[PDB]
């Protein structure tokens, strides 16, 4: 069962987590698209100075990140806009964030985060940002005309709230 | 004709460039190694606050960079410590630094540099750093037991000096 990721650029779903209860710090999903550019997911504890975006630009994964330890805009991995399903896994390990595409590690951002446990509320938004696209380090057009399935986000034990699925649209 | 990249951790060669004469901002070489960790090349305009390192860690490319615009430690691309020759190309394009391995773009560090043209002296060191390994953002053991061939560095028109090849050791 798959869902569409995208007129407005609002995300299709938002989840909130209690950071003091996170034990699993990874997320996995599959994505399919013919679209070269857009947001796959966004997360923050504060949209002004502690946020993260995973998207596509020119078909390839791009991460933008802004927190106390790091500020970066990085592209990596193969093009994903070929209309095939691709597995993507994001993992936080130690002080690094890892990106795996189709079971291959394609990017490791080292020394970018202290302990999640140590503002204890994190938001994850699917298919859009929780601020205007002009707030990005490098703007992109957020609407990703793609589909998402088999998605699991961090720790269901730590989840406080999740948006009304009434809005989800099947692919 | 190939040369060894590595007891001391000193680089095997240093070149100096006039930054005001650089037109070609790319470098290409081939590397072969069974070694998972070490420095491939280092460059700077100032070893205290304007420097760059490309190496291997756990077999894969790693870039460490520290300048006015960016400070990062990033891993990307496939393992290269399989004893096969691999082409590596580093390109500066706009404000980004691009890494290509075997003809595939594996990493794009965006918004990390202003114009090279605009201290106008850049050093490139092969197989070692021009400061102690403890100065790195994330230390590694610099000696890379590998071989280097078909290597071209930036713009021969901009090169001011190049170290005595008397020291080079054929593979
Ligand atoms: C706290 C904090 C932060 O400094 C601010 C925003 C956080 C990301 C939000 C989204 C996210 C989702 C996610 O899914 N698997 C692992 C992760 C971890 C990441 C990449 C989080 C890593 C730590 C980040 C950068
Ligand atoms: C100036 C300046 C800097 O901010 C300080 C050190 C510079 C690198 C030195 C080594 C280098 C060699 C090289 O080989 N092809 C392209 C490049 C460009 C790079 C990656 C350079 C990019 C710009 C850098 C980060
Ligand atoms: Ca789009
Ligand atoms: Ca080594």
Swiss-Prot record, chains A, B:
Q: Where in the cell is it found?
A: Secreted
Q: Where is the Laminin G-like domain?
A: 3-171
Upper lineage: Eukaryota, Metazoa, Chordata, Craniata, Vertebrata
Q: What is the protein's given name? A: Sex hormone-binding globulin
Reading the lineage from the top rank, the first entry is: Eukaryota
The function of this protein is: Functions as an androgen transport protein, but may also be involved in receptor mediated processes. Each dimer binds one molecule of steroid. Specific for 5-alpha-dihydrotestosterone, testosterone, and 17-beta-estradiol. Regulates the plasma metabolic clearance rate of steroid hormones by controlling their plasma concentration.
Per the UniProt entry, what species is this protein from, by scientific name? Homo sapiens (Human)
The UniProt subunit note reads as follows: Homodimer.
Which cysteines in this chain are paired by disulphide bridges? 147-171
**Tissue spec. comment:** Isoform 1 and isoform 2 are present in liver and testis.
């Amino acid at each position: 069962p798959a869902v569409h990721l995208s007129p407005g650029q609002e995300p299709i779903a938002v989840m909130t987590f209690d950071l003091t209860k996170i034990t699993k710090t990874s997320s996995s999903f599959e994505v399919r698209t013919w679209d070269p550019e857009g947001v796959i997911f966004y997360g923050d504890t504060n949209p002004k100075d502690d946020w993260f975006m995973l998207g596509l630009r020119d078909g390839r994964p791009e991460i933008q990140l802004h927190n106390h330890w790091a500020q970066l805009t990085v592209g990596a991995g193969p093009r994903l806009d070929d209309g095939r399903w691709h597995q993507v896994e994001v993992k936080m390990e130690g002080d690094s964030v890892l990106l795996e595409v189709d079971g291959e590690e394609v990017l490791r951002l080292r020394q970018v985060s202290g302990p999640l446990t140590s503002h204890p509320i994190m938001r994850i938004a699917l298919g859009g940002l929780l601020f205007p696209a002009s707030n990005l380090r490098l703007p992109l057009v957020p609407a990703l005309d793609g589909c998402l399935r088999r998605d699991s986000w961090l720790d269901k034990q730590a989840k406080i709230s999740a948006s009304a699925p009434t809005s989800l649209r099947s692919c």
